[PDB]
Chain A
């Protein structure tokens, strides 16, 4: 119900978004997934301070391990980038500090899940920094395992970040992408041995289009329209937002030019 791009969702859940992105230039649809993949910001541990670690894993091994852990990233858009916040080092308006305390309680194996993470700085009341669980059993990922008098004491300073800087800041997972099932654009030349038709399978996406008809001659003037995407969220940002924030961030850095361009005109000609 607009005048441009025409999305239509077919199936979509807590973690999946199956839609046809009608009526767009290719160069767009692509730049959309890339910016998606790794240009939206998120929160994830980016500094670990180690008090004691007598586990079987080594310090930086867990340190790395923690980064990857999906931290909630909703109201993340109102947390200053740590590299801007005038505060020396880290602070509460540019970081959610977390703490980890786990000891080998019993003689049986002591699992250290992420549920065991403790927010310690003021959230100034915003949705952000709650480590994320999807585990039925209610346990968020798995950090380390313990046995007896094995202590582990940690302090995590999570920060704002872009995947482009490190994949631990990726809210993307895998992004499905396909245009033109029945290859009517002849964008690909099929490698074969006999009936190229029986040699490749047809993707579910073929039921949404028509057979090429061999009796018809190749269509030359034809550009790529209609893409069959499917975005999956890691979970720190709901599915919908990833795509939405994607569109935004694109639009954003697109304008940061359109502006910066204008900020060079009234620069030389003016004074």
Chain B
């Protein structure tokens, strides 16, 4: 119920440090448990060091749901988001 339509740019297109970190973390928790990786490992084996390469290739299947005080919220996929910092 009541979710801000695809458009209407009310927030940042850029990724907050707390989003990026939290995402990296979440993939890192899947990479750790023999879950499929969606990148060719260049010869690395650390779930946190990996997820970083999954982030560069932009192939992490996660959607940030950003919350606005009133109760409404926005959805940004890790395709849409810019990783700058």
Q: Do chains A and B touch in the complex (CB under 8 A)?
A: no
Interface residue ranges, A against B (CB under 8 Å): none
